[PDB]
A and B are shown apart, each in its own frame.
Chain A
């Protein structure tokens, strides 16, 4: 959770901002992209 000093006037707008972003795909898109973006391992065969 994003923090803020107690009583700061910025607490409410950031709260509404994160609500809006969650409604948009910004959060899900960022999480899906950053994680698994460059997975080196694993990005079966039959052998004798």
Chain B
């Protein structure tokens, strides 16, 4: 883990969580798209 300093690993974890949450939200908050065949696996 030396090649990347501790701060970068921390912020990597933060951004992984942020991206996962944002993707979940974006894919599955609009009822219009997935209302039919209730529609996305995200």
Contacts and interface: CB of A to CB of B under 8 A. Distances in A.
> Binding site of A, secondary structure by majority: helix, strand, loop or mixed?
loop
B7 to A, nearest CB: 10
Interface residues of B, number: 4
Contacts of A48: 2-5
A: contact size bracket: under 10
Interface in B5-39: 5
Nearest to B1: A48
Interface in A20-48: 48
Nearest to B8: A48
B6 to A, nearest CB: 9
Interface of A: 48
